[PDB]
Design a protein around this ligand. Structure first.
Ligand SMILES: N#Cc1c[nH]c2nc(N)[nH]c(=O)c12
Ligand SMILES: N#Cc1c[nH]c2nc(N)[nH]c(=O)c12
Ligand SMILES: [Zn+2]
Ligand SMILES: [Zn+2]
Lengths: 361, 361
């Protein structure tokens, strides 16, 4: 397998379906990446993660650097060996969680991260897809602040590019994605896309659209932002999102997603269904013998009832988190397969319409 | 398969190995039963429980009656269908956890349980091995109080026997075990055994020896107590225990065990090894690439290191509980297999000696 090869097999409108080939395996696109923050996709064994259909998972620079430490993981063989996931891993660069969980042109010191250290940590972890180190931009933001932040990010993008390229082992075996910023302003988004395309990356994320924008605003910004990115490279929407956001984003040209919604909200009692989300803690399920979802092919829906999972979550039992999380990730993966299949057949616009009508019924 | 058939295949000293055949399956003896308190063996899927080697699990009358309710579980198909375990289940009678978690000759009311309601709840749950309803006796206890408590228990044992026998579906499909009491006093233990043997049960537990007795005192009481029980029926030591207690108990004639040690202490960081217990949270494991135990054939030891599991537990990650608990239960089951195998070959006394020397090295 190549270091990196993205190939588009089919298109419909702005939507695309294909694959990313990497040394550690193939990623079908559009793709959903389960989030694993402390070297684990919470409450799931790696094998379970794979069984739901995931091709790739996301790991977090900020968290692992803190615990258990990047150097320590490298010493122990790298993130893949450490956690038991032998397939691709995308690592975020850290500056996102640092901002959420001392800021200068050099990077940031908190209770150090720079483009150079970020790129090195990701290397130490053995990441397959390295994210450029950026300055996330709060929402809302004034144009001047958004401009300033965007410009820094483009300078940090160039620094990321060069630190990556300097490490022969990393450059020959991993990929590097740049991140577009500019808040919701078309001109800043154009400038950022141009700057990133001039540096040149293996893939392009759309950053800064998961920090409080509602779906309408997010879509209108994607509407103009994604066509500015090179067409022949993957387009990654960071931190998005709900099933309906994912469908509308793919309709706008996005190829990759991550989100903590299905794991996090799964442990909180929220289960995804084709008929929309349900809160399994609700008393209406105490004697409901139906599976979480009527059509889901996951092991959880094959074996246990709503009523059982209701009891487990109300009791704060670990198995409840386990089963909720397995279902929800399986659901996300099945949505992704239906999007892929429907674009491959020229019926994705019909699929998106049908999905919505049911999901919001 | 019969309702109930216990057959002894081999003996060595007081030790016995054989099987219990029941409609839902075969139980190899000596047996370890994982404890599942709120319709779950904590942090494990039923299939995982089975993969470790468990033939039978224990469910709790007191807990399920409270949440989710006995009648509710019956409505939903019974405990087996509800939780996804289709093999035998032993249910405790409830009066143990009631005493630990309004006492009269009729039973007990708390913030009602009588022999009759206990036996009915266990029926509602669909239990395979029903425990008589007893009055557990605190340790230490004066002879007079122990005598009084024991006598009540024998009256409650007779009431249990008759409530069970009255329910044709239960009597034709389940088994009933009586529980010996009498604290640590040989005369009271003799009286209780005689009384239980006169009523007649399918199996005999040794109750009241897991409420603070140290191993020396527990063994001396087993020394005289187990030969008082009918030889051709299973002997069950309730709430025991550590690996070394289990070995010494089998050397004294016990056939069945339950304990929360491997699940509970597993989620707390304690891992069992043939070299004795380890606390995986200890800093000495932060970069230890060895499996939890050098010889363990469990999936956990096949796949992950001490260092990883160290990180997960320190981080309070659910996967840490999952893997710790799977290992510990697998360990207990492997101990049980080595006891069974060694008695079948007339080398159990050598095995017990060898186990100890290493375990306590
Ligand atoms: N909005 C937002 C995102 C959620 N992940 C993010 N990751 C970095 N590295 N940049 C970001 O803009 C975002
Ligand atoms: N000691 C003790 C036991 C731990 N489980 C117990 N179960 C009942 N039903 N009686 C008991 O004597 C005990
Ligand atoms: Zn499902
Ligand atoms: Zn093991």
């Amino acid at each position: 397998r190549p270091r990196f090869s993205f190939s588009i097999a089919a298109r419909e409108g702005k939507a695309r379906t294909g694959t990313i080939e990497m040394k550690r395996g193939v990623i079908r696109t559009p793709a959903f990446m389960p989030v694993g923050t402390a070297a684990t996709v919470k409450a799931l064994k790696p094998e379970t993660v794979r069984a739901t259909g995931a091709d790739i998972i996301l790991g977090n620079t900020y968290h692992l650097m803190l615990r258990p430490g990047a150097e320590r993981i490298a010493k122990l063989g790298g993130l893949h060996s450490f956690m038991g996931w032998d397939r691709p891993i995308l690592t975020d660069s850290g500056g996102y969680q640092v901002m959420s969980l001392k800021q200068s042109e050099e990077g940031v010191t908190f209770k150090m991260l720079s483009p150079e250290r970020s790129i090195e940590i990701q290397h130490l972890l053995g990441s397959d897809i390295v994210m450029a180190f950026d300055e996330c931009t709060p929402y809302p933001a004034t144009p001047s602040r958004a401009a300033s932040s965007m410009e820094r990010s483009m300078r940090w993008a160039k620094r990321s590019r060069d630190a990556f390229d300097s490490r022969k082992e990393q450059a020959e075996n991993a990929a590097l994605f740049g991140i577009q910023q500019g808040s919701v302003f078309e001109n800043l988004r154009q400038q950022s896309a141009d700057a990133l395309a001039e540096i040149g990356f293996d893939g392009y994320a759309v950053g800064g659209l998961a920090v409080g924008q509602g779906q309408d605003e997010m879509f209108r910004v994607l509407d103009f932002s994604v066509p500015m990115l090179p067409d022949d490279k993957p387009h990654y929407l960071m931190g998005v999102g709900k099933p309906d956001d994912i469908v509308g984003a793919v309709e706008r040209g996005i190829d990759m997603f991550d989100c903590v919604l299905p794991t996090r909200s799964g442990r909180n009692g929220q289960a995804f269904t084709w008929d929309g989300p349900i809160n399994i803690r609700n008393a209406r399920f105490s004697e409901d013998l139906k599976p979480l979802d009527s059509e889901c092919h996951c092991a959880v829906c094959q074996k246990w009832s709503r009523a059982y999972i209701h009891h487990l979550i109300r009791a704060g039992e670990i198995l409840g988190a386990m089963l909720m999380t397995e279902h929800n990730i399986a659901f996300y993966q099945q949505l992704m397969q239906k999007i892929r299949d429907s674009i491959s057949e020229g019926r994705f616009s019909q699929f998106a319409q049908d999905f919505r009508a049911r999901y919001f019924a």
